[model samples]
Target: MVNPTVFFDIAVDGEPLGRVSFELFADKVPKTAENFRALSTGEKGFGYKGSCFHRIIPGFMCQGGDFTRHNGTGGKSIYGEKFEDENFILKHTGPGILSMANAGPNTNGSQFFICTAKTEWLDGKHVVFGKVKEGMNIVEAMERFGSRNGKTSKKITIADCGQLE
Candidate 1:
């Protein structure tokens, strides 16, 4: 089957930043991929919408998915508070790779990150389940707001998000 695609309509402190899309690695990490897909579409009544990209490191990646706290400290998966890492078949080779942001092994939650630079060290540690299919420019715009400490100067919010047909 074809990999699923999703999108995020981003904004910085309420200013529109355009949309970005991802093609999920459902064939490799089905469960992990579905969690993001569901969260994006928000069929569960709560999701990526209105959540902030709480952590952003310029050379690393932009982290978000904490709809509950809107910070790096909170978010829950559709399954529950957390889920196990499905597999590490996908590698974090370069920019735009999408992967789970877990606390530790098998601690997958709703949190995830999009790479802005090469991060080969994360391979096998984080489950890479998608890649940017469009709007990497919007991601680059968000990257500009990031500091070295994973903090964005302005609040980067997911103004809207969902499965892209």
Candidate 2:
């Protein structure tokens, strides 16, 4: 099946950044892909819109999808507050890898992260569900806001988000 594409319009402290789109690996991780798809379209009452990228690391990745707290601490999946890990078929061999952010085993929720650089160490630890297809520069620009520990000095928000045909 053809993969799904979703996008997010980023903003930092109310100022617009560029848009980034991702290719969801539904053929590999169906449940994980659909969860992110639903969140992007906001077909449910709550989603990634207005949510902030709570953690970002230069040369690493940017993480978000915590619509509940807008922080790394909380987020709820369309499947409920949490769901099982779909699979680890995809590897984190390089940048643009999209994966689930979980508390532990089978703890996937709405939270996810986009790799900005190679992170093969994360291979089996996280479920690689997608990859960025366009606007990687925007993600690189976001790196400027990262501090030493992935915490950002600025609030990087998904000002808007949705699925694209």
Cα-based lDDT for every prediction: 0.91, 0.89
Deviation from truth (RMSD, Å), model 1:
0.8
**Residue-wise lDDT of candidate 1 within 1-165, one digit each (tens)?**
999999999998999989999999888889999999999999998788988988899988999998887777889999999999888888988999998998888998899999998999888899999999999999999999999888778989999999987
Q: Kindly give the stretch of ten consecutive residues in candidate 2 with the minimal lDDT sum.
A: 64-73
Q: Please write out the lDDT profile of model 2 over residues 21-78, one tens digit for every residue.
A: 9999889889899999999999987788888988898888888888787768888888
For candidate 1, report its TM-score. 0.97
Each prediction's TM-score versus the true structure: 0.97, 0.96
Best by TM-score: 1
**Which portions of model 2 show Cα errors greater than 4 Å?**
none
